[PDB]
């Protein structure tokens, strides 16, 4: 095939009150999906990872947005669907821990080995393995790593970097939370070092600050780390304006746009859930964000450049962009930002399915590192959490629920969550999978070893 | 293809520890995945749901059951794979209710049209629509209809009845609840009058206790239900015994087991969620349940009689397997009782494509209605709700959690969930469908109107 068919309209056929009037597929699929089809080597590969985006997320946020009925053209949009498990290691026992954090989970489809919560890039044995980025410039292709994030954040962090502690951003925190990777010890250097010492082509994100920390040895001691990106040839870019001039990124003229102080700003705001929030509350509705500023791109802006830039590699391009604060707002019991967040990511989704379906051999995968605290109750439930009334794009007021932590921050699930693709050995994300299939996969696909 | 490979061993590979240790798929799906595609007519249709059964309750189970690193061998064996919309309509709006209950649900995938929540086979208009049950019979196919709850349940209900109020059980409550389906007034009945009118050649499941009621009017009034049964030609049985020794169930003959005067007896035991259980209270593993009797048969049993005396039609049958219990110990708190629940309709499913390889026509689909309350949150977990401490067959202890409501039952949640297929017009179930497509997948697959 010239191409294989991404989803097209999935959704409600009709007036979902008639028969067949909520129906999302029109006719029988076998066919079609007998065109999606294929096992031609996957010249390119895009994942795009939802933070904490389980099923639940999905639903939520379609519902406010496009309805019940409704259909996300980019994150439903992808013809090939399954379900995968993500639980961590336990550090001491080599046991599974049920509900993985945002770093073993990143490292589980980045190196293809499970590993304790907080590892990046290291085993429960602390020994390195590496990554499918690093893998990808090795044989020659591209790099790109986009985040709305801090880029030290676990996410990005786990495809340039081998620490102990996730927690060992830049310099200092090294130091002394990963004493055995502080580059004055010998280690090869905080997050921050590492990922600037991986020089991946194309690298988006927030979290500038950490880049204000000056290195304690090696050959740039003194110099912040930031001074040290401009002296090992690095065009950096701080606003949509600059990201939008840069004509050409690569080894030679590597980019790095730090768009942010620490994570980037959220799209919609909306007040925090609240104990019986969806009765003793009155029903929201989501609105923009006055502290996003139009000088701070978004997903999909970020998503694109580094498509555009990536895509003059004759040899191929590897490329992960993240919904970073879905999980965030998840965590923050705040429904009009974890929403907003999806819808954002949604974009970037589309865009991906854009290049990807002109293109031909590029394998884009959508998914999520692990559930999160989010359910969608009934209006009249009373939750011992905390819930909130959203007014949702069908008229009809959607009550949501965090109840599953009592700490100041709602929390991870260990349900198993889809993962959508399409393309280029797309067919090994149905059924049921594992978090590290999917690094073997996309190895695969690239034909990479 | 003689036959579509049903998903072999998924179970991670080999020490979770190690680089692939944890992978489940060992080579490239895509031609294995071209495999299961087809579009040859199905011949039977076995439909096996799992009662508020999303994938968080699957991964709970296989958790405690197989480990995290396991594998079902029948709910997970499952080649084709999706997610699915089930919200339900508002009475008065006709606008979306995101939270279905077990009726609305257990009617949009049965008539295909969506309906308000208490709902059985009639929109929110009040008109009644043939169900796929109905359908196939006329059609001259054989119908089977297998519960662990009381036949008068929603789900099983749902394909022999048609009443304005899934509460109107028998004769009485309908009279007053339903007066516009009371038979005496002119309906076609209580949900147990029009089962025993609709006729399936096989029924088994439990709620012996609403066939104690007698006839308001018609030709069979003063007669008890359960003495008109015996009087239209129907075949009573009472236990494992009595349905071993039934060699034959047809129209002449059908077949009619009541193995309990309410639900069927839960599989394990356990104790109940508790506020702060994680941490207050020890470690718990389930044990087999002292009440359930060894003459009641199990799920599976039910499910291999059925498929057998069903089998024996030159034109086909179809069938509906109902792990109705899992909902009810979810709504409870109740996790041994959830997990044990899912992990007996998993044999039930075993049986379902042990038939459904060797035969080769056979379209199994294996889903639930709704999502449900419960939650995998973290071992220190301090969670609103109600959490317990489980000991699974990894070694590790697996805390679960229900935090959803303070009413004394948890509920419901509106989440998109898994629906997993192998066989005729499988490819149908793949990407994101809705509720109501099932049923219209049923129908082509079966070539039915
Ligand atoms: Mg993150
Ligand atoms: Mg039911
Ligand atoms: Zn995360
Ligand atoms: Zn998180
Ligand atoms: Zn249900
Ligand atoms: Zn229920």
Same mark, same amino acid.
């Given at each position: 095939?010239?191409?294989?068919?991404?989803?097209?309209?999935?959704?409600?056929?009709?007036?979902?009150?008639?028969?067949?009037?909520?129906?999302?597929?029109?006719?029988?699929?076998?066919?079609?999906?007998?065109?999606?089809?294929?096992?031609?080597?996957?010249?390119?590969?895009?994942?795009?990872?939802?933070?904490?985006?389980?099923?639940?997320?999905?639903?939520?946020?379609?519902?406010?947005?496009?309805?019940?009925?409704?259909?996300?053209?980019?994150?439903?949009? +992808?013809?090939?669907?399954?379900?995968?498990?993500?639980?961590?290691?336990?550090?001491?026992?080599?046991?599974?821990?049920?509900?993985?954090?945002?770093?073993?989970?990143?490292?589980?489809? !980045?190196?293809?080995?499970?590993?304790?919560?907080?590892? +990046?890039?290291?085993?429960?044995?602390?020994?390195?393995?590496?990554?499918?980025?690093?893998?990808?410039?090795?044989?020659? +292709?591209?790099?790109?790593?986009?985040?709305?994030?801090?880029?030290?954040?676990?996410?990005?962090?786990?495809?340039?970097?081998?620490?102990?502690?996730?927690?060992?951003?830049?310099?200092?925190?090294?130091?002394?939370?990963?004493?055995?990777?502080?580059?004055?010890?010998? $280690?090869?250097?905080?997050?921050?070092?590492?990922?600037?010492?991986?020089?991946?082509?194309?690298?988006?994100?927030?979290?500038?600050?950490?880049?204000?920390?000056?290195?304690?040895?090696?050959?740039?001691?003194?110099?912040?780390?930031?001074?040290?990106?401009?002296?090992?040839?690095?065009?950096?870019?701080?606003?949509?304006?600059?990201?939008?001039?840069?004509?050409?990124?690569?080894?030679?003229?590597?980019?790095?746009?730090?768009?942010?102080?620490?994570?980037?700003?959220?799209?919609?705001?909306?007040?925090?859930?609240?104990?019986?929030?969806?009765?003793?509350?009155?029903?929201?509705?989501?609105?923009?964000?006055?502290?996003?500023?139009?000088?701070?791109?978004?997903?999909?802006?970020?998503?694109?450049?580094?498509?555009?830039?990536?895509?003059?590699?004759?040899?191929?391009?590897?490329?992960?962009?993240?919904?970073?604060?879905?999980?965030?707002?998840?965590?923050?019991?705040?429904?009009?930002?974890?929403?907003?967040?999806?819808?954002?990511?949604?974009?970037?989704?589309?865009?991906?399915?854009?290049?990807?379906?002109?293109?031909?051999?590029?394998?884009?995968?959508?998914?999520?590192?692990?559930?999160?605290?989010?359910?969608?109750?009934?209006?009249?439930?009373?939750?011992?959490?905390?819930?909130?009334?959203?007014? *949702?794009?069908?008229?009809?007021?959607?009550?949501?629920?965090?109840?599953?932590?009592?700490?100041? !921050?709602?929390?991870? *699930? $260990?349900?198993?969550?889809?993962?959508?693709?399409?393309?280029?050995?797309?067919?090994?994300?149905?059924?049921?999978?594992?978090?590290?299939?999917?690094?073997?996969?996309?190895?695969?696909?690239?034909?990479?070893?």
């Amino acid at each position: 095939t010239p191409e294989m068919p991404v989803l097209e309209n999935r959704a409600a056929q009709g007036d979902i009150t008639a028969p067949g009037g909520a129906r999302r597929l029109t006719g029988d699929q076998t066919a079609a999906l007998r065109d999606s089809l294929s096992d031609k080597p996957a010249k390119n590969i895009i994942l795009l990872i939802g933070d904490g985006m389980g099923d639940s997320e999905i639903t939520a946020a379609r519902n406010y947005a496009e309805g019940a009925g409704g259909f996300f053209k980019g994150i439903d949009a +992808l013809p090939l669907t399954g379900q995968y498990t993500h639980y961590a290691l336990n550090k001491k026992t080599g046991k599974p821990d049920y509900v993985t954090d945002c770093a073993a989970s990143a490292t589980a489809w !980045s190196t293809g080995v499970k590993t304790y919560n907080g590892a +990046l890039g290291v085993d429960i044995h602390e020994k390195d393995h590496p990554t499918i980025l690093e893998m990808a410039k090795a044989a020659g +292709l591209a790099t790109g790593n986009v985040s709305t994030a801090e880029l030290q954040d676990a996410t990005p962090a786990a495809l340039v970097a081998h620490v102990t502690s996730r927690k060992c951003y830049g310099p200092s925190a090294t130091s002394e939370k990963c004493p055995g990777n502080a580059l004055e010890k010998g $280690g090869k250097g905080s997050i921050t070092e590492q990922l600037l010492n991986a020089r991946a082509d194309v690298t988006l994100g927030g979290g500038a600050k950490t880049f204000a920390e000056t290195a304690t040895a090696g050959e740039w001691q003194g110099k912040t780390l930031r001074e040290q990106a401009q002296a090992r040839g690095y065009q950096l870019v701080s606003d949509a304006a600059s990201l939008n001039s840069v004509t050409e990124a690569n080894q030679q003229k590597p980019l790095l746009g730090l768009f942010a102080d620490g994570n980037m700003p959220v799209r919609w705001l909306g007040p925090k859930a609240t104990y019986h929030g969806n009765i003793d509350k009155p029903a929201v509705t989501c609105t923009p964000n006055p502290q996003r500023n139009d000088s701070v791109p978004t997903l999909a802006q970020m998503t694109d450049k580094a498509i555009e830039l990536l895509s003059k590699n004759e040899k191929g391009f590897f490329l992960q962009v993240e919904g970073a604060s879905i999980d965030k707002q998840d965590h923050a019991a705040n429904p009009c930002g974890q929403i907003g967040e999806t819808v954002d990511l949604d974009e970037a989704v589309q865009r991906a399915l854009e290049f990807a379906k002109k293109e031909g051999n590029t394998l884009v995968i959508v998914t999520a590192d692990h559930a999160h605290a989010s359910q969608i109750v009934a209006p009249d439930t009373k939750a011992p959490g905390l819930t909130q009334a959203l007014n *949702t794009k069908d008229g009809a007021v959607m009550v949501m629920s965090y109840g599953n932590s009592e700490e100041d !921050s709602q929390e991870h *699930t $260990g349900s198993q969550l889809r993962i959508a693709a399409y393309g280029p050995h797309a067919a090994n994300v149905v059924g049921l999978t594992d978090q590290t299939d999917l690094f073997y996969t996309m190895k695969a696909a690239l034909g990479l070893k």
